[PDB]
Design a protein around this nucleic acid. Structure first.
Ligand code: MG
Ligand code: MG
Ligand code: MG
Ligand code: MG
Ligand code: MG
Ligand code: MG
Ligand code: MG
Ligand code: MG
Ligand code: MG
Ligand code: MG
Ligand code: MG
Ligand code: MG
Ligand code: MG
Ligand code: MG
Lengths: 205, 177, 146, 48, 110, 215
RNA sequence: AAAUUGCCGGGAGGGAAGCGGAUGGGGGCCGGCGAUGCGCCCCGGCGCUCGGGGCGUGGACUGUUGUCGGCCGCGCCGGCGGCCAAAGCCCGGGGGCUCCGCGCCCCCGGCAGCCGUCGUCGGCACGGCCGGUACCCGCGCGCCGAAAGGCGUGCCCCUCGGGGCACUGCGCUGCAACGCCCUGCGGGCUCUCCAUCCGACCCGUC
RNA sequence: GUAAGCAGAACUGGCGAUGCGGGAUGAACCGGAAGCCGGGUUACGGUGCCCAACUGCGCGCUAACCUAGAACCCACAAAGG
RNA sequence: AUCAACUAGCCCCGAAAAUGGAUGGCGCUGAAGCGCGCGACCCACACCCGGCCAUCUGGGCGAGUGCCAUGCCCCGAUGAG
RNA sequence: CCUGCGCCCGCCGCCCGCCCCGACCCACGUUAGGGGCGCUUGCGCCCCCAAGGGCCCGUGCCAUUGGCUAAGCCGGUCCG
């Protein structure tokens, strides 16, 4: 992993059905390479090995605390966005100025808040579940783990997403109509211009 | 391209002594990754089978055996002797390959996989082209079926070359088998 | 200490130094005792020629003199009717009556680290490592250290 | 390029007979199998 | 972007600084590593071998009437398989320059 | 042929032919000439204490710079740098110093006749026909700068007056430009869109990969 | 004088600081920090040196390109040789298998389209670092040519191309073309502060 | 000697006296020994992130509801299922 | 169509300790685990090519236009403490 | 609540500083399946592999001196 090499102002990544470790590794190198990343829908991140293994792993994590001052001890986050951020922090040198700067470039959210709902959301093929996991091997959703370890905002994230997904689908239909009339325009204009568009025939698909 | 393994005839005999100006000549068919390793393994068997060491011996000829019809599919049997963690065993195998070199390469691979056996621990007794109608293993027989038909249940999603690699993509990959 | 002494006699006292040897029962039994430390094989015409032109240096009065020209050979050997670099090649390749003199004349070759790498140096060539006899395959290794 | 009699006859047919017969005879030698009828115990397992 | 304002021919390709030539315990500031936009194989970067590069930054005070400063370089050789190049500049790049952008030009053309 | 030429050059016979010791065997009869002894000055004005070593007027004769194979007259070049970066121009001929002589043409691009170093150019595939254009009036000294002194520091009085003055490009050079571009445009006017092509600049729109892009 | 302290100005700070290598930003300082002279010339006065012009030059430091060497790295393409080479391809022949993977498998003999492995020979394109000539190369001594470079005679060779050898002499012998700045908001600095990456445990002692 | 990072011997090498690369970390384990530099290439070891170098091309085995397992020395696991 | 023993790969049981906790960490499940391979690549103060400093070696310089001769120049190898 | 001599807001006159260099693009869902379009509302048709695509005067010395200007497109501003 070297880096995307892209000049985008930011890259919004829809983390649904990505693998936490593979996604975190890709995102971490991007942050080090100076890029800014937004990751949305972290409740939908997938983890290999079922819920039971992942619950056990997380409750071993709850055991670790400074015996004489637990508030100083390891800080156990419940929200999926914070689970993602600490997994990324594990893959960055975060005790240097350079790694502090890298972590600043990362924003992680549960669900798709504004303005990121009207933005195009990219996917990282190297971490997708369909390509990285063999159908029939246990996995859980990072939202599911948080629910069972004490994240009390699962339902509000669910309420908000349904209203957004409905609001996005009517927009799907509105563009669906606009796409069709534009298509008929394509023909109607492309017959108005005859040989004058001949140079495009062998390079079109 | 190259085959990792090659089949060799190796010919050799003891040194002519003040008696026996015509010592007896031996041959084997050996598998190795080059001539040098082929000659070395010849002198292994001929020390421990026919009691002639490389020192008191002489090398006569070494030739590479090639497949006659590489473009066709042959079934194969391999009789092999190997060493486990607690002894020695005899094992028989069936393979399908266009060349017998290809058949041997699979055999070493499945021994290192299914049994953790390394190449310095395997001796190939006998090799053969078992014609179909006499193949024993069930894996090899299910391919002896004209009207063979099956889907590709596993299919790699990857660009033609790394030139077209990206990190991000607009849409999810579209797969159907 | 015994391995150390033999490599001094073979004029190999630095890694990736190369020299030319005559086959002998006396010689082969010296390589058997230092084999983990050396790779060796049978050189051919191209390997013997390119080594001597490109990386050949003479031992004139205990000093390492590059064989940039033929007069160095004439003054180096001369007495043994070796006059040119091309007869110096011939003297080495077809082991001749003065192979002793024309091979001691050549200073030990100083070779590159092999372009493309080695396999495991710790094993014999037969095992898949690099030590020992690799008879004609030494020529492939010459191309990559020359 | 201009189809001069390239690689014209190096030798005659009868030599081409014995030449190709000889190498082919050396071919059966190379790929010849041992019978394996030395091993009474393993004769069935070996298939011979 | 319709009716934009800005410099309005692009004769260069964007590149980003990744750090210096490294081992896991040593660092060599004389050669920096540069990711070039759109190259994705070790054979694709033979095209850029030798091309000049410019790290353009802004200093705090004006000199010759501008705050802009530029240090020039060239692409030397590929680094790895995926299309990263070793870059050499007149001066070693700033350690804070990593994660920033460089301009890869076509000037010493072939 | 690099080595084949090299073998030919060092041939004992052929270097005799090359140097021309025949035809020097001619003048001075059945012999090869002698020489004499210069430096009979007998008039040192000074005597340096350093062990003197005089001025070099080198006899070494560096080979002329090579022209890239695809830079053939009439081909359209893209300028990669300078104030005309991106401009598409016409290649006329190589000059004596090796610099390429190019024209906008100035009617179309605004690029006059000028030298461009071959390094800063990418040759395109398209071809103009210029083998009825006359270019011998141009040579390297045409562009010879004849630069003046350092005394005219551009100062507040001088900043815009230089712009508001005109003592610059002289009358014959602007008359020259009209001669060539008038001839050039005829063959340019033959090719459709070739006039538009030169008036535009080359640009890297997003996703254009030079190592892929054929020109 | 130092330790240590106050005031003024400047700089930096998330549980040490200091340190070694890099460089970037600020400072502060550096005019031997960086040149304007030398050769032909025409006078007009004191062959030699100053006063005007005419004349070609010529200056720290640094920029780009070219061309020659040296070492290196990468990519492409072509020829030859060995093997029974086999093979696919085109033709011909040879064995059993019993409704079967069945238009089955294996085998051999001719030949004239492509394609392993091992060795070798050749050409070409790109790129990196160093160097710039007192000899090695190279130049003048003849002509042509802007310059590459070419131009002569005789013997040997195939016999196209053209090829190879020939007698050899005198001297000479630090590669170039353009730039930028020139008391400046310029150039650099081994000095000071700070930032960042990498490295980095406190010395003496047994 | 039940053994011990225990006590005593034989041959060789190392540390001590020695930096450097790797084994996360370590006096003696692996590579390798050194003037101050430029360029090239390697050894041991590696190429998901930390961390320079492929989420490279192949074939199998493993599914752990015990912290599956994952580095010569080396930081154990046995009889038995 | 099937039965019985045996055999050996990975997995599981056998498998208990005191601050909170360690395949180095995060993590990984057509692996980023295990075994065997194939292409490249990355990485030492080691090897190669070059400059420079020092050591050591071997040379050249008088009927001297000749020199800190305790000097300059040339050649080769070398450099830990 | 918001400093009676203190502050705030709006317009143009710009001048610096800052980022950038086309810094253009909203479906959900699954992948042993899905997508667009018609009519039995399920059937047909066509498409399924990568944004490897579309869009955009995309073309003027960050952009020459003046006039004119459809239809179309982009910005600021007014209102809803
Ligand atoms: Mg990396
Ligand atoms: Mg390499
Ligand atoms: Mg290795
Ligand atoms: Mg060892
Ligand atoms: Mg004091
Ligand atoms: Mg203060
Ligand atoms: Mg510091
Ligand atoms: Mg500084
Ligand atoms: Mg060169
Ligand atoms: Mg046949
Ligand atoms: Mg002591
Ligand atoms: Mg180096
Ligand atoms: Mg000495
Ligand atoms: Mg040394």
């Amino acid at each position: 992993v070297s880096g995307s090499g892209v000049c985008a102002k930011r890259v919004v990544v829809d983390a649904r059905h990505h693998m936490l470790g593979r996604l975190a590794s890709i995102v971490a190198k991007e942050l080090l390479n100076g890029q800014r990343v937004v990751v949305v829908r972290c409740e939908e991140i997938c983890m290999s090995g079922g819920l039971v293994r992942q619950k056990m792993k997380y409750l071993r994590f709850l055991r670790k605390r400074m015996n004489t001052k637990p508030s100083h001890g390891p800080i156990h986050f419940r929200a999926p966005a914070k689970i993602l951020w600490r997994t990324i922090r594990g893959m960055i040198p975060h005790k240097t100025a350079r790694g502090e700067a890298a972590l600043a470039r990362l924003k992680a959210y549960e669900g798709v808040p504004p303005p990121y709902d009207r933005t195009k959301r990219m996917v990282i093929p190297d971490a997708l579940k369909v390509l990285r996991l063999q159908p029939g091997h246990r996995y859980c959703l990072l939202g599911q783990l948080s629910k069972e370890v004490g994240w009390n905002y699962a339902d509000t994230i669910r309420e908000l997403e349904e209203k957004r997904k409905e609001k996005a689908k009517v927009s799907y239909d509105r563009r669906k109509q606009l796409a069709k009339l534009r298509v008929k325009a394509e023909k109607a204009a492309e017959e108005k211009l005859g040989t004058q568009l001949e140079i495009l025939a062998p390079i079109k698909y | 391209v190259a085959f990792r393994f090659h089949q060799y005839q190796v010919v050799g005999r003891a040194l002519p002594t003040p008696g026996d100006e015509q010592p007896k000549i031996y041959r084997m068919k050996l598998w190795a990754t080059n001539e040098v390793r082929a000659k070395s393994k010849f002198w292994y068997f001929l020390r421990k089978l026919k009691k002639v060491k490389k020192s008191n011996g002489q090398m006569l000829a070494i030739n590479e055996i090639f497949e006659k019809n590489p473009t066709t599919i042959k079934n194969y049997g391999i009789w092999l002797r190997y060493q486990s963690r607690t002894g020695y065993h005899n094992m028989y195998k069936e393979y399908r390959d266009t060349t017998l070199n290809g058949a041997v390469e699979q055999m070493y691979t499945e021994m290192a996989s299914r049994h953790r056996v390394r190449s310095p621990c395997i001796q190939i007794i006998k090799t053969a082209t078992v014609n179909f109608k006499l193949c024993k293993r069930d894996n090899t027989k299910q391919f002896h079926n004209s009207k063979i038909k099956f889907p590709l249940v596993y299919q790699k999603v990857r660009p033609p070359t790394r030139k077209l690699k990206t990190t991000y993509k607009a849409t999810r990959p579209n797969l159907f088998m | 200490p015994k391995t150390k002494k033999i490599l001094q006699l073979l004029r190999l006292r630095q890694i990736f130094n190369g020299v030319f040897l005559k086959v002998n029962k006396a010689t082969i039994n010296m390589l058997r005792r230092v084999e983990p430390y050396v790779a060796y094989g049978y050189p051919n015409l191209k390997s013997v020629r390119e080594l001597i032109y490109k990386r050949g240096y003479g031992k004139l009065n205990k000093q390492r003199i590059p064989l940039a020209n033929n007069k160095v050979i004439e003054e180096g050997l001369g007495k043994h009717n070796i006059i040119c670099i091309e007869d110096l090649v011939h003297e080495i390749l077809t082991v001749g009556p003065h192979f002793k003199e024309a091979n001691n004349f050549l200073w030990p070759f100083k070779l590159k680290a092999p372009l493309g790498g080695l396999k495991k140096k710790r094993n014999h060539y037969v095992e898949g490592g690099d030590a020992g006899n690799r008879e004609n395959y030494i020529n492939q290794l010459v191309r990559r250290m020359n | 390029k201009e189809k001069i009699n390239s690689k014209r006859t190096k030798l005659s047919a009868e030599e081409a007979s014995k030449i190709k017969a000889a190498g082919k005879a050396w071919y059966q030698t190379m790929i010849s199998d041992s019978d394996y009828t030395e091993f009474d115990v393993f004769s069935k397992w070996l298939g011979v | 972007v319709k009716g934009r304002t800005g410099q309005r021919v692009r004769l260069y390709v964007r590149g980003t600084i990744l750090g210096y030539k490294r081992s896991k315990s040593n660092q060599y500031e004389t050669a920096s590593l540069v990711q070039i936009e759109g190259v994705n194989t070790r054979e694709d970067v033979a095209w850029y071998g030798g091309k000049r590069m410019a790290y353009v930054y802004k200093a705090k005070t004006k000199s010759n009437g501008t705050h802009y400063r530029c240090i020039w370089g060239k692409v030397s050789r590929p680094h790895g398989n995926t299309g990263v190049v070793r870059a050499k500049f007149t001066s070693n790049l700033p350690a804070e320059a990593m994660g920033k952008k460089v301009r890869v030009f076509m000037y010493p053309s072939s | 042929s690099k080595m084949a030429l090299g073998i030919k050059r060092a041939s004992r016979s052929h270097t005799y032919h090359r140097r021309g010791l025949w035809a020097i065997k001619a003048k001075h009869g059945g012999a090869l000439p002698k020489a004499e002894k210069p430096a009979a000055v007998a008039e040192p004005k000074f005597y340096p204490a350093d062990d003197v070593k005089p001025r070099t007027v080198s006899t070494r004769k560096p080979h002329p710079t090579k022209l890239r194979s695809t830079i053939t007259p009439g081909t359209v070049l893209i300028l990669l740098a300078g104030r005309y970066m991106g401009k598409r121009v016409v290649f006329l001929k190589q000059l004596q110093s090796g610099l390429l002589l190019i024209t906008g043409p100035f009617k179309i691009n605004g690029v006059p006749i000028r030298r461009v170093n071959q390094a800063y150019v990418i040759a395109t595939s398209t071809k103009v026909d210029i083998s009825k254009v006359n270019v011998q009036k141009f040579d390297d000294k045409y562009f010879a700068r004849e630069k003046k002194t350092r005394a005219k520091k551009t100062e507040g009085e001088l900043f815009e007056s230089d712009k508001e003055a005109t003592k610059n490009l002289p009358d014959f050079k602007k008359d020259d430009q009209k001669v060539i571009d008038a001839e050039l445009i005829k063959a340019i006017d033959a090719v459709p869109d070739l006039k538009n092509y030169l008036g535009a600049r080359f640009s890297l729109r997003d996703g254009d990969k030079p190592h892929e892009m054929t020109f």
